[PDB]
From Swiss-Prot, chains A, B, C:
Swiss-Prot/TrEMBL GO biological process terms: adhesion receptor-mediated virion attachment to host cell; symbiont entry into host cell
Induction: Expressed in the late phase of the viral replicative cycle.
Protein name: Fiber protein 2
Family per similarity comment: Belongs to the adenoviridae fiber family.
Statement: the UniProt record of this protein carries the keyword Isomerase: no
Taxonomic lineage: Viruses, Varidnaviria, Bamfordvirae, Preplasmiviricota, Tectiliviricetes
CC annotations in GO: host cell nucleus; viral capsid
Domain of life per record: Viruses
Miscellaneous field: All late proteins expressed from the major late promoter are produced by alternative splicing and alternative polyadenylation of the same gene giving rise to non-overlapping ORFs. A leader sequence is present in the N-terminus of all these mRNAs and is recognized by the viral shutoff protein to provide expression although conventional translation via ribosome scanning from the cap has been shut off in the host cell.
Keywords: Capsid protein, Host nucleus, Host-virus interaction, Late protein, Viral attachment to host adhesion receptor, Viral attachment to host cell, Virion, Virus entry into host cell
Compartment annotation: Virion; Host nucleus
UniProt remark on domains: The tail region anchors the fiber to penton base capsomers, whereas the shaft, built from several repeated motifs, allows the knob to protrude from the virion.
Residue window of the full protein shown: 206 to 410 of 410
Function summary: Forms spikes that protrude from each vertex of the icosahedral capsid. Interacts with host receptor to provide virion initial attachment to target cell. Fiber proteins are shed during virus entry, when virus is still at the cell surface.
Subunit structure and binding partners: Homotrimer. Interacts (via N-terminal tail region) with pentons.
């Protein structure tokens, strides 16, 4: 068995808004993504692109509190059926017989707050970990400014009363606009690269 | 065959100014570098050191526009003959029969503006991607302050009119001086480390 | 022999305060750490967690001259018996016959100031290289605010008069409190990830 493994999911051209992301005001929406991870001997490197198109993201409730939200969270999961809040799709594994457990991040020993999926507050704010600064690309009148991303391996309490370790990425826009229904266009960000310890070196199924 | 490969170019001495770098005022200059790259199963990691010695970098013209310039760009290329704006030198491949195409970055899906080499405008500002913060080391009276580095995989229209994907690094100084002919010394920065998706896993020639 | 190798030291529990760290007021103290490193074909990646508990860190002398320190340094070393200022413990190598010399960082060609362990000032400030921003987790009255980490490969003159290359991590707290003996609690930070070139590709003993 290889001491190196890769997982890829999403659309190479950020074309299919199958991701379920949530704004800091608890409004879900849809975005495209491209996720490319490698496990090198127990260290997980995750490369993530995200794109949100106002014409394919869904309904933006009016109201100051809803339109003025600047943050949104994307969950990267290796438990694509048991615990997958953002709906990361099945992808491509290399070697093809490698277990998805090869992309589970190690338990985070700083012990951040649990994301409790049983209380149906769908927004979790990633807060404890590295903050990286990005400038995204726009089209239309949408202008988020620069976006910092907080990255935090987090225990997620599923409805089955068990905790699973996922990576929360919270995108922190400098300016309001993505969630204001009068503002239109697209914002695309990445590659957002995160490194953390994996639960294990790569294992075959 | 190997799922991991390495490319090394430049000199550890940082005293061979063969790099063709360009200030935001469109003034070319000579600088030293040391580039060490690894491809791990389709993920490209780049370590770059840059060093500029005012006595070897070439004539610095006077005038506010030239002397007050704080930004400069270095292009990292895997197409050393066909599209190599900053003159990355032939280097060492491990294993020795691995193809340079193993160090090609994957097309950036956020689609940033193309660098058109045919326009005879040598400076391109890296804008879209991660910004990392460095403190460099100086000698002499030269003092750039801290330097942030923006890192962007970019399509480049080469002089043969094929489009190639390269990595733009724009170094953003806090203080002017590097391009002031009355300010002398050296500045050395690094290791500046970038991760992005490669176009492929490693392949032999 | 593998072109990939791993080293792990410390405890995931972050409750064994055997690390010897030093504040900016030259006061030593004890902390817990969990260090996981990988060498991929000559590229060294370091994941580091640090935790400090006021009940186990040791005596914090009184007086603003001591209590107002916001910075501390942690030395990551591969020379565990000859040059190991923070007392990184023997750990676990994968594969088990791989040399510790596989985790030695390459000499830093920007040539930052040497740390001479034979003289009597224990605090060394990491200055030259990347600065990364983290938010840590607290318990108790302790609040350091956010913490930036400066990461610098550094020549260290050991007490045997040989110079070794090590990695200096200086943790820069936004607020004082950690070294004020009337403030109690814990602070845990990470994963702090650093990449730099290794002195060599992995080699077996």
């Amino acid at each position: 068995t290889s001491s190196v493994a890769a997982f890829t999911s999403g659309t190479i051209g950020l074309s299919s808004p199958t991701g379920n992301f949530v704004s800091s005001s608890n409004n879900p929406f849809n975005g495209s993504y491209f996720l490319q991870q490698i496990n090198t001997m127990g260290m997980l490197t995750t490369s993530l692109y995200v794109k949100v198109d106002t014409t394919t993201m869904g309904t933006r409730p009016t109201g100051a509190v809803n339109e003025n939200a600047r943050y949104f969270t994307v969950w990267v999961s290796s438990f694509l059926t048991q615990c997958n809040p953002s709906n990361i799709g099945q992808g491509t594994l290399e070697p093809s017989n490698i277990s998805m457990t090869s992309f589970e991040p190690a338990r985070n020993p700083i012990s951040p707050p649990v994301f409790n999926m049983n209380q149906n507050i769908p927004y979790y704010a990633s807060r404890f970990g590295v903050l990286e600064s990005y400038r995204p690309i726009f089209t239309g009148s949408l202008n988020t400014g620069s976006i910092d991303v907080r990255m935090q391996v987090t225990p997620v309490l599923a409805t089955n009363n068990t905790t699973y370790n996922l990576i929360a990425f919270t995108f922190q826009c400098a300016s309001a606009g993505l969630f204001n229904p009068t503002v239109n266009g697209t914002v695309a960000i990445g590659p957002v690269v995160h490194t953390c310890p994996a639960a294990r070196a790569p294992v075959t199924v």
